Amino acid sequence: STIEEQAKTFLDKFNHEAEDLFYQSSLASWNYNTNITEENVQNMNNAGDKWSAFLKEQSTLAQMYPLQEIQNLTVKLQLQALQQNGSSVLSEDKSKRLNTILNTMSTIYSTGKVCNPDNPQECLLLEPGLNEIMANSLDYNERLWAWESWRSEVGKQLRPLYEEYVVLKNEMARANHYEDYGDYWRGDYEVNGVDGYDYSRGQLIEDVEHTFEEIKPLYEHLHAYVRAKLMNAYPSYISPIGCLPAHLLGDMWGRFWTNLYSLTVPFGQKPNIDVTDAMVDQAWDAQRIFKEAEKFFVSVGLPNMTQGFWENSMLTDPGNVQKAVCHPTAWDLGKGDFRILMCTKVTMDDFLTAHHEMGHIQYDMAYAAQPFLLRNGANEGFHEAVGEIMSLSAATPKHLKSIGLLSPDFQEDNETEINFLLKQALTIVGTLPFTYMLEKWRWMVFKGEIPKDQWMKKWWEMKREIVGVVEPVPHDETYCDPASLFHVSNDYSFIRYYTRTLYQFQFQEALCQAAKHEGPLHKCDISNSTEAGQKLFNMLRLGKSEPWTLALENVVGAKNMNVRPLLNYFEPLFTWLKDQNKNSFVGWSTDWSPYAD
Amino acid sequence: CPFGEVFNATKFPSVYAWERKKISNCVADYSVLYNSTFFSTFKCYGVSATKLNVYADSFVVKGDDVRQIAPGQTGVIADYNYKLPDDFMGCVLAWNTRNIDATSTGNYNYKYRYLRHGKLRPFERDISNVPFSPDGKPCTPPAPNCYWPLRGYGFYTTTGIGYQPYRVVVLSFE
Numbered sequence: 188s189t190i191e192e193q194a195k196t197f198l199d200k201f202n203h204e205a206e207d208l209f210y211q212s213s214l215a216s217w218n219y220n221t222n223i224t225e226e227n228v229q230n231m232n233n234a235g236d237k238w239s240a241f242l243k244e245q246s247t248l249a250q251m252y253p254l255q256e257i258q259n260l261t262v263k264l265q266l267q268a269l270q271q272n273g274s275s276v277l278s279e280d281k282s283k284r285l286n287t288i289l290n291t292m293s294t295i296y297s298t299g300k301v302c303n304p305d306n307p308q309e310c311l312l313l314e315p316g317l318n319e320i321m322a323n324s325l326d327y328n329e330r331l332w333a334w335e336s337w338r339s340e341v342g343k344q345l346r347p348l349y350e351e352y353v354v355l356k357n358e359m360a361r362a363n364h365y366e367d368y369g370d371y372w373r374g375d376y377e378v379n380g381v382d383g384y385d386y387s388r389g390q391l392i393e394d395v396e397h398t399f400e401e402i403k404p405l406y407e408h409l410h411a412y413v414r415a416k417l418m419n420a421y422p423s424y425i426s427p428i429g430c431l432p433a434h435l436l437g438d439m440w441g442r443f444w445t446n447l448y449s450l451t452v453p454f455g456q457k458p459n460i461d462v463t464d465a466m467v468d469q470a471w472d473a474q475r476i477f478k479e480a481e482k483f484f485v486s487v488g489l490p491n492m493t494q495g496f497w498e499n500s501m502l503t504d505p506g507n508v509q510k511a512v513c514h515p516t517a518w519d520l521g522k523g524d525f526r527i528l529m530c531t532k533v534t535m536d537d538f539l540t541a542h543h544e545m546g547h548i549q550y551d552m553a554y555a556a557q558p559f560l561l562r563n564g565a566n567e568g569f570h571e572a573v574g575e576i577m578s579l580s581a582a583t584p585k586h587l588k589s590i591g592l593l594s595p596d597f598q599e600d601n602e603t604e605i606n607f608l609l610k611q612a613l614t615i616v617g618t619l620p621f622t623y624m625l626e627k628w629r630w631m632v633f634k635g636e637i638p639k640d641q642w643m644k645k646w647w648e649m650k651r652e653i654v655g656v657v658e659p660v661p662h663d664e665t666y667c668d669p670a671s672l673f674h675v676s677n678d679y680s681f682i683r684y685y686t687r688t689l690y691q692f693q694f695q696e697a698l699c700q701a702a703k704h705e706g707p708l709h710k711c712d713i714s715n716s717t718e719a720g721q722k723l724f725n726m727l728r729l730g731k732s733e734p735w736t737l738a739l740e741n742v743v744g745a746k747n748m749n750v751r752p753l754l755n756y757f758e759p760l761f762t763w764l765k766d767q768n769k770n771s772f773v774g775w776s777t778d779w780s781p782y783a784d
Numbered sequence: 785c786p787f788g789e790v791f792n793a794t795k796f797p798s799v800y801a802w803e804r805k806k807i808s809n810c811v812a813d814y815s816v817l818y819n820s821t822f823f824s825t826f827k828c829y830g831v832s833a834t835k836l837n838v839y840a841d842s843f844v845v846k847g848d849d850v851r852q853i854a855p856g857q858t859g860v861i862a863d864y865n866y867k868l869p870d871d872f873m874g875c876v877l878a879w880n881t882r883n884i885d886a887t888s889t890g891n892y893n894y895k896y897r898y899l900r901h902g903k904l905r906p907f908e909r910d911i912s913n914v915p916f917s918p919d920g921k922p923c924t925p926p927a928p929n930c931y932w933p934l935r936g937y938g939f940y941t942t943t944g945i946g947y948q949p950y951r952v953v954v955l956s957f958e
């Protein structure tokens with residue numbers, strides 16, 4: 188009958204076919220990540236191919252039912268999703284070529300190794316070795332070399348590929364009725380239909396810029412403080428008013444200043460909110476770690492892990508014989524099958540990691556009652572935010588205490604707290620500007636606002652403007668630095684990294700209020716609090732189902748992305764920096780350069 | 785009395801093509817099933833006693849689908865495969881058969897019907913594997929808007945309980 192009703196019958200066939208076929212792709216992909224064989228790595232492609240095809244087939248098959256002739260919101264969403272011409276809306280060659288582009292970039296990146304300018308028998312890869320330098324080296328030159336080698340080898344090689352990349356991908360974007368590839372991505376946060384909850388592809392740019400403003404003071408101050416500390420480690424190389432030399436920021440790009448802790452620690456004479464030693468002493472095994480986390484969730488009103496979770500998961504490294512990939516992952520195979528794959532070691536870190544990944548699983552179950560196409564965090568950054576809330580409560584000394592891993596009568600200390608806070612800023616706050624500038628430049632190279640010859644002239648105008656970072660060596664168009672970063676040269680929207688950050692703070696905030704929290708926002712643990720849970724599980728059981736703006740409302744009572752909870756989390760620190768920066772200079776000169784002479 | 789043949793039997797049918805065993809004459813005690821935590825449902829809709837005095841239907845369904853073999857009840861299984869009258873009744877027993885009906889490779893023999901014009905009248909059956917179209921029109925799959933109404937479950941040993949194989953036996957009383 189009606190094209191709507193006959194479209195329902197379509198989805199109702201898809202969900203049934205997807206469930207089955209998706210599970211086969213998962214099971215195979217699983218056998219592989221836990222038993223790296225040839226027979227296993229073989230199936231990992233087959234079922235994974237039936238999948239890609241099946242979707243392509245179901246996509247064009249759905250490209251019939253006219254989105255325009257529907258009034259049921261859900262069925263409209265689901266169809267919209269299934270209707271992705273994406274790669275198949277181009278010429279015969281223009282598509283296959285884009286793939287050659289995408290594919291080689293991924294491989295020149297993962298493969299590219301740089302050789303010693305004097306010892307050509309040893310050559311380092313980005314991981315490890317190269318990233319090992321950027322992370323530990325206190326030698327101005329050794330760091331200077333690695334940073335430049337990489338952006339010089341793979342840097343250049345990617346310039347031509349990317350050149351064409353931005354064209355074909357843009358051609359595709361405008362071909363689907365999007366202002367540019369940048370508009371294609373911002374699309375993810377788009378919502379049409381339910382009013383008072385809509386959100387336009389441009390609204391993101393506005394909301395991200397408007398919010399980034401309120402981060403500046405905090406950042407400028409973290410910046411100023413880190414600078415002065417760096418000046419000490421690298422005497423005479425840094426300017427008391429200049430930007431910071433990109434190669435001295437802790438990792439290859441300066442995405443995170445995490446590794447800078449060593450030389451920026453406020454009170455080096457403090458010590459170890461590291462219970463690794465304690466866990467090891469009380470004979471804790473993987474089991475305990477995971478059972479302990481399960482308890483944490485049950486403590487807030489969430490379900491015990493499924494029988495088949497303890498039954499089918501792999502919480503320990505198989506060791507010899509059976510080889511397996513170890514990146515901690517939370518699997519949702521579907522069919523009610525949930526698993527965690529993790530080569531657990533008895534560290535406070537793996538302990539926190541396990542609370543994080545068991546958060547993803549807990550989200551996966553919450554929305555598993557949704558129809559296949561709706562099982563997934565609201566927007567790209569919801570799932571990460573949730574997993575991060577957990578590690579946030581589990582990290583508190585309060586929690587480590589009540590769990591018997593921290594001495595029963597150990598005290599706070601307003602100094603050991605300023606430390607922890609900084610360790611966090613170095614990572615959480617340092618990334619934001621970087622992440623936000625990266626995507627800005629990327630967005631503009633999509634709205635066409637940057638000429639092929641001002642690609643690095645405009646890159647670094649901004650690293651100096653926004654992030655407050657200067658290049659150690661000047662870079663012309665022989666390079667293409669905003670591409671030596673995995674996410675860039677492997678085609679991934681970077682902005683998620685920014686929103687999820689904000690989100691994850693708006694979440695933790697509500698959930699502490701909700702669970703009636705006393706002290707500063709950062710010392711909060713939400714355990715034993717079924718009350719908070721309820722509120723979390725409110726936006727959890729939705730999945731992609733309601734607009735992401737609604738979903739946020741469910742936990743934070745607001746239709747939008749607010750950054751004040753992120754600053755509240757950093758208030759005891761934020762003010763403390765304003766004191767250190769008493770006689771330091773705060774801000775920078777885009778003009779100063781390391782190389783200049 | 786001839787209950788052994790029923791639930792102790794080897795092969796069970798799919799839901800859409802269920803079995804109705806006719807048991808009259810002989811006498812059974814009911815202590816056979818009374819005493820046993822083997823079953824995971826054992827709900828009854830009328831009584832729960834004895835008197836040494838009868839229809840037994842059997843089929844297999846997904847875990848989460850067991851809640852539908854009961855009076856009233858939502859749809860899909862209850863709408864297109866097996867329906868209990870809101871009225872009449874006896875008991876409904878089920879047990880997890882993940883060992884038997886599920887293989888680690890995937891078992892798709894057991895099937896169900898997800899598309900049909902209308903709902904089943906209680907105790908009605910439909911073994912009509914005829915290409916479905918949401919308008920009565922005949923079907924020539926792969927023509928668009930044509931789907932086969934009969935699908936296989938796909939019982940893997942590793943699914944969640946909601947997706948594991950359960951054998952059902954509805955005991956009707958007459």
Ligand SMILES: [Cl-]
Pocket residue numbers: 433440668669
């Ligand atoms: Cl860079």
Ligand SMILES: [Zn+2]
Pocket residue numbers: 543544547570571574
């Ligand atoms: Zn994660």
